[PDB]
Ligand binder design. Structure first.
Ligand SMILES: Cc1cc2nc3c(=O)[nH]c(=O)nc-3n(C[C@H](O)[C@H](O)[C@H](O)COP(=O)(O)O)c2cc1C
Ligand SMILES: Cc1cc2nc3c(=O)[nH]c(=O)nc-3n(C[C@H](O)[C@H](O)[C@H](O)COP(=O)(O)O)c2cc1C
Lengths: 217, 217
């Protein structure tokens, strides 16, 4: 509405209404938000698993079977459950896939502009995978940027969601065969409509005062 | 005009118009955006620096040195410049500051409900802090989540912005004494209004197809 109005009214939902499914239109919009999120050098080091079926959702809920049981209902009652994944290593095949896609979309006027752009991405990529040896952590951050974009995007659509770190990535990666494919699960985000059992919806929002976290100059 | 339109039309502005400044209401709005962002266990492991004066922006612009001289113009021409910083380590006092804030906000019905939220947080904290030994990374991921929330947010307000990783953190940290305060600059986001020289405002948007990044189940 006010994007500040949605920012202030949104909340991580604790209980979902199993009966409230997303319309095919919202299911499409939600996917658009996942795809069009920005990332450093437009590297898009990610993969998304959108579960809509009960068998699919239950497959995801398998990762919270351990000591994260209090999270299962959340992944089952929600309409769609999206698991954000990040690349395990930045490879040359992925970088070529990006600039070639940028070229296909008409972003370069000459072949030199494309070369310069590829060289520029390589500068950052090599800085992480060659020098600092932190390319995996680098890419993981880009996915979290996407989740942040996503959580605000859904709230603005009028949908309820909750980010979940409380799940076993080892089991999740195993169940979907990810990272044989070069990926690792990071965040599981259930999307749908909240029920009445969600007490968090009627509680006041809480954040530290700006005089603690903000410095103006 | 819904958010999908907002996400499709926004772009990483390459050139800023120094004459077009943020309105006073817009200044308080981007601050509200920064603070009201979600984060794992509401840990809010962050600090921000909002530079709006010539003196402040030049101080940040110092980080745009050596190999990053190409980003100096963006930091000086943008109306406001936000430096997203993350805590260098999770200390018990900060965990206490968070719990007591939620309490003063009325999020707890009983004192036993407040303690349960504390141990719930400490659980995740000690997980990264003690076990995994990756709390610095964990907290930075929450800061990248704020950037994703912030980027979509300012775009929704009608502003132009650009995430910048290309800058020397060691210079920026030292210029603001962040180091001794337990923080580290990670992302710089100049916000304002793009100028006619911003070629990125007219080029087509490019993202990989969903048949590569998305898997439905
Ligand atoms: C990355 C991330 C992970 C989270 N994981 C969980 C979780 O496992 N379970 C849960 O109930 N809430 C989880 N949350 C919700 C946060 O605690 C919530 O953002 C915080 O309490 C602030 O409340 P709000 O989101 O309503 O503004 C998570 C949030 C984030 C950003
Ligand atoms: C974390 C991050 C860092 C970025 N760093 C820079 C930068 O240093 N300079 C720049 O001009 N663009 C930078 N970008 C912009 C990206 O190249 C841009 O997000 C990508 O090309 C997609 O274009 P769009 O944001 O216009 O959709 C960055 C983006 C992100 C998310």
């Amino acid at each position: 509405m006010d994007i500040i109005s949605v920012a202030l009214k949104r909340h991580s939902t604790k209980a979902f209404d199993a009966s409230k499914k997303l319309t095919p239109e919202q299911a499409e919009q939600i996917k658009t938000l996942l795809q069009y999120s920005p990332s450093s050098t437009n590297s898009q080091p990610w993969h998304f698993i959108v579960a809509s079926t009960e068998e699919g959702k239950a497959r995801v809920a398998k990762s919270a079977a351990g000591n994260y049981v209090f999270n299962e209902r959340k992944m089952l009652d929600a309409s769609h459950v999206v698991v954000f994944c990040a690349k395990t290593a930045m490879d040359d095949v992925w970088l070529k896939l990006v600039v070639d896609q940028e070229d296909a979309d008409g972003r370069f006027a000459t072949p030199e502009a494309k070369a310069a752009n590829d060289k520029g991405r390589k500068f950052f990529a090599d800085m992480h995978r060659k020098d600092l040896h932190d390319d995996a952590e680098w890419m993981a951050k880009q996915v979290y940027l996407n989740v942040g974009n996503f959580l605000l995007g859904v709230a603005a659509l009028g949908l309820d969601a909750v980010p979940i770190e409380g799940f076993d990535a080892a089991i999740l990666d195993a169940e979907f065969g990810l990272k044989e494919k070069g990926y690792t699960s990071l965040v599981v985000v259930p999307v749908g409509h909240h029920s009445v059992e969600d007490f968090n919806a009627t509680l006041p929002k809480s954040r530290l005062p700006q005089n603690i976290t903000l410095t103006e100059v």
